């Protein structure tokens, strides 16, 4: 969905900073499982796993 983090200046004007996945990784349902979250232990776990 995207995320407005904070601001940065562009040629003098305050503007926004957005962080979001590159399109190809957010087009299809199955692509949801391709994202990993770090676990306390330190290993990566896929959405498919929860």
């Amino acid at each position: 969905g995207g995320s407005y983090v904070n601001d940065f200046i562009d040629r003098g004007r305050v503007k926004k900073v957005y962080v979001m996945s590159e399109a190809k990784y957010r087009m299809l349902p199955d692509d949801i499982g391709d994202w990993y979250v770090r676990a306390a232990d330190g290993q990566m776990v896929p959405f498919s796993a929860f």
Binding site: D10, R11, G12, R13
Partner: protein, 50 residues
């Protein structure tokens, strides 16, 4: 007060009229219409004053 070293000290009688009491003179404004920046805006100011 023109005496006082390295400082601007002016005594003036209130406009004793309205918002055009200091009369004459002129209030000019130098604008940065591109993302020039402060440094360049300053230089443009000097060039104009010169």
């Amino acid at each position: 007060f023109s005496q006082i070293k390295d400082a601007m000290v002016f005594a003036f009688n209130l406009p004793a009229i309205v918002e055009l009491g200091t009369a004459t003179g002129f209030d000019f404004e130098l604008i940065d219409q591109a993302g020039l920046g402060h440094e360049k805006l300053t230089q443009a100011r000097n060039q104009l004053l010169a």
